[PDB]
Every structure is written in structure tokens, then in C-alpha cells.
Design an enzyme around this catalytic site. Sequence first.
Site, PDB file in Angstrom:
ATOM      1  N   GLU A  35     118.524  56.910  40.764  1.00 41.00           N
ATOM      2  CA  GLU A  35     118.357  57.655  42.051  1.00 41.00           C
ATOM      3  C   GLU A  35     118.880  56.815  43.221  1.00 41.00           C
ATOM      4  O   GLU A  35     119.518  57.375  44.130  1.00 41.00           O
ATOM      5  CB  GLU A  35     116.900  58.007  42.231  1.00 41.00           C
ATOM      6  CG  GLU A  35     116.430  59.096  41.334  1.00 41.00           C
ATOM      7  CD  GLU A  35     116.999  60.483  41.540  1.00 41.00           C
ATOM      8  OE1 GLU A  35     117.908  60.627  42.383  1.00 41.00           O
ATOM      9  OE2 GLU A  35     116.606  61.395  40.772  1.00 41.00           O
ATOM     10  N   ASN A  46     121.680  67.046  50.290  1.00 41.77           N
ATOM     11  CA  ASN A  46     121.783  68.120  49.269  1.00 41.77           C
ATOM     12  C   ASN A  46     122.603  69.306  49.799  1.00 41.77           C
ATOM     13  O   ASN A  46     122.690  69.524  51.017  1.00 41.77           O
ATOM     14  CB  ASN A  46     120.385  68.546  48.862  1.00 41.77           C
ATOM     15  CG  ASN A  46     119.529  67.411  48.329  1.00 41.77           C
ATOM     16  OD1 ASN A  46     118.380  67.220  48.758  1.00 41.77           O
ATOM     17  ND2 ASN A  46     120.071  66.697  47.365  1.00 41.77           N
ATOM     18  N   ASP A  48     121.829  72.341  49.876  1.00 40.92           N
ATOM     19  CA  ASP A  48     120.990  73.345  50.575  1.00 40.92           C
ATOM     20  C   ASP A  48     120.667  72.907  52.000  1.00 40.92           C
ATOM     21  O   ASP A  48     119.885  73.604  52.645  1.00 40.92           O
ATOM     22  CB  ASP A  48     119.754  73.669  49.734  1.00 40.92           C
ATOM     23  CG  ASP A  48     118.685  72.586  49.699  1.00 40.92           C
ATOM     24  OD1 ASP A  48     118.983  71.469  50.147  1.00 40.92           O
ATOM     25  OD2 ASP A  48     117.547  72.876  49.247  1.00 40.92           O
ATOM     26  N   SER A  50     118.853  70.114  52.672  1.00 40.03           N
ATOM     27  CA  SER A  50     117.750  69.130  52.590  1.00 40.03           C
ATOM     28  C   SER A  50     118.429  67.768  52.317  1.00 40.03           C
ATOM     29  O   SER A  50     119.605  67.712  52.084  1.00 40.03           O
ATOM     30  CB  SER A  50     116.760  69.503  51.544  1.00 40.03           C
ATOM     31  OG  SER A  50     117.322  69.424  50.280  1.00 40.03           O
ATOM     32  N   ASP A  52     117.540  63.798  50.359  1.00 40.94           N
ATOM     33  CA  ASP A  52     116.709  62.948  49.465  1.00 40.94           C
ATOM     34  C   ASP A  52     116.555  61.555  50.079  1.00 40.94           C
ATOM     35  O   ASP A  52     117.555  61.035  50.577  1.00 40.94           O
ATOM     36  CB  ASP A  52     117.341  62.804  48.085  1.00 40.94           C
ATOM     37  CG  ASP A  52     117.506  64.080  47.290  1.00 40.94           C
ATOM     38  OD1 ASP A  52     116.713  65.016  47.508  1.00 40.94           O
ATOM     39  OD2 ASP A  52     118.297  64.062  46.333  1.00 40.94           O
ATOM     40  N   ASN A  59     112.578  64.665  48.203  1.00 44.54           N
ATOM     41  CA  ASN A  59     113.373  65.712  48.888  1.00 44.54           C
ATOM     42  C   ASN A  59     112.613  66.250  50.102  1.00 44.54           C
ATOM     43  O   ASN A  59     111.352  66.321  50.074  1.00 44.54           O
ATOM     44  CB  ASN A  59     113.787  66.773  47.877  1.00 44.54           C
ATOM     45  CG  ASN A  59     114.803  67.756  48.408  1.00 44.54           C
ATOM     46  OD1 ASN A  59     114.412  68.763  48.983  1.00 44.54           O
ATOM     47  ND2 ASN A  59     116.082  67.490  48.214  1.00 44.54           N
TER      48      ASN A  59
HETATM   49 NA    NA Z   1     120.102  61.310  43.077  1.00 46.32          NA
END
Ligand code: NA
EC number: 3.2.1.17
Length: 129
Positions: A35, A46, A48, A50, A52, A59
Site C-alpha cells: 500500500e 482514487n 471516484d 476519494s 487513500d 480511504n
Molecule cells: Na494502494
Amino acid sequence: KVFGRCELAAAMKRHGLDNYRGYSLGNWVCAAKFESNFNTQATNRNTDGSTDYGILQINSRWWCNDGRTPGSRNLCNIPCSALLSSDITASVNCAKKIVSDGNGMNAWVAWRNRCKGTDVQAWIRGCRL
Ligand code: NA
Ligand code: NA
Ligand SMILES: [Rh+]
Ligand SMILES: [Rh+]
């Protein structure tokens, strides 16, 4: 902060992640590796709208408020910036809520695609815990 592997393993163990909802510490270390590359400051947008945040890429669509994700929730009751701290407490506590939400660690697509079904014990091998 960029953690070392065993440093992050120890910090996650102290904060109660080892075998949390049955996920061994190696699962959490493996997820953090793919990650964030163990970087608390990691952020990624993201599709959409959003974002992370942090060591486990939590998120803003569901878990935190970043002031710019419309029609979203803040289920961990934190500003998303809290997830970027050198202190991983907020990310750990929020991860415990996420992994309890019904899909376990499949909530982290990196865990499903890179850690699930692999030898995740390798991520804590050699560490003093
Ligand atoms: Na990721
Ligand atoms: Na949000
Ligand atoms: Rh701590
Ligand atoms: Rh020990």
C-alpha cells in the site's frame, strides 16, 4: 516517517494487530508494504475523487474526512491527515474498524492481490517481536 519492516511489525504488534480478526502480523506488514512502501505520508487519488491516506492507504470515501470527498462518510471519526502521522495509532485503530466491516482484509485490494495466499510470515522473519 518511512518505517523499517521489523520496526513496523513491532509497532503493529504493540497496537494489537497480531492475529486481530485472525490476521497474523505478516498480513498487516505485507499490506503496508504494497500500500505505502511503509511510508506514513503516502497519499493516492482514487478514480471516484476519494483519496487513500497513510501506511495502510485508508480511504476518504468511507473512513476519514479530507474536506474534499463529496457524498462520503467519516466512520473512523478522524481527519484524513491524522493517518499521515509518524504515530500509527489512528491508522491502526481505523484499520481494526475496517477489517471488522465484513470483508476482512479483502478491503485492501493490495492485500487480496499481493499478500492473500502467499507466505506472509516471510514479512516478519528475523524480527525481534
Ligand atoms: Na494502494
Ligand atoms: Na470522508
Ligand atoms: Rh505507538
Ligand atoms: Rh516476544
